[PDB]
Amino acid sequence: GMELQDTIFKRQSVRKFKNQDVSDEDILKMIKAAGAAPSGKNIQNWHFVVIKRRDLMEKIADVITKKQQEILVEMDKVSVDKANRFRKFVKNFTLFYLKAPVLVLVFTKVYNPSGYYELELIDAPKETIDKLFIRNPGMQSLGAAIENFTLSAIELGYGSCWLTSQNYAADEIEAVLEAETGFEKGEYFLGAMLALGVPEDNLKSPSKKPVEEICTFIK
């Protein structure tokens, strides 16, 4: 096993991977850890789709690219500068996931949080109800589950990168998954993906805020 703080401070966004496998049994451990995460009213708004199928990983890449190109055709009319930065960004911060042996699609569902049905019952303005979602407790919950998964990967000798940069193409990703596998998402939609494998060594991360910057102790 591995001690908690060790895993926490070891954690990086892994974007380069060794040519080694990740066992289904180890992935299942990661998922059990995710499943034990806290969630708003125990909604447990998560479902992990584990993909090792190369052609499916590549088909998902292709749909991201198709959607990205549709956006780029319009961006080029406004600012080739901005369009070109987007071209580089998707390459380096989305499609790098093909470098890993495992792609995990994390599906989720909307959690209507405390206050929502109470305010709806009394015909509160939508503007008031919307304020509950600026701090989206449903996505806090998803993040707790994905962080449990992430730390457990590290304990088991692996590492990962969390991804939401694909989500302008989420509908298209869901569609190809369904065509290729018959997976039925129901009310769920894509929340995040994880690129998962054995990390290369000597990976880099940006500096973080000093702990004293991110807190205030009231005296």
Ligand X SMILES: Cc1cc2nc3c(=O)[nH]c(=O)nc-3n(C[C@H](O)[C@H](O)[C@H](O)COP(=O)(O)O)c2cc1C
- Contacts with Cl ion by CB under 5 A lie at 113-114, 137, 164-165
Binding-site member from 190, 195, 197, 199 for its own copies (CB under 8 A): 190
Long-range contacts of 47-50 (CB under 8 A, 24+ apart): 47/106, 47/107, 47/108, 47/188, 48/104, 48/105, 48/106, 48/107, 48/149, 49/104, 49/105, 49/106, 49/107, 49/177, 49/183, 50/24, 50/102, 50/104
The answer to the question of whether 128 is labelled as a binding residue is no
The answer to the question of whether 87 is labelled as a binding residue is no
Instruction: Output the smallest distance, CB 182 to ligand X, in A.
Output: 27
**How far apart are the C-alpha atoms of 213 and 28, rounded to whole Å?**
37
163 binds ligand X (CB under 6 A): yes
The answer to the question of whether 149 is labelled as a binding residue is no
216 binds ligand X (CB under 6 A): no
Query: Among residues 27 and 61, whose Cβ is nearest to Cl ion?
Result: 61
Residues lying near ligand X in the complex (CB under 6 A): 12-13, 15, 38-42, 93-94, 137, 140-141, 144, 161-165, 192, 205-206
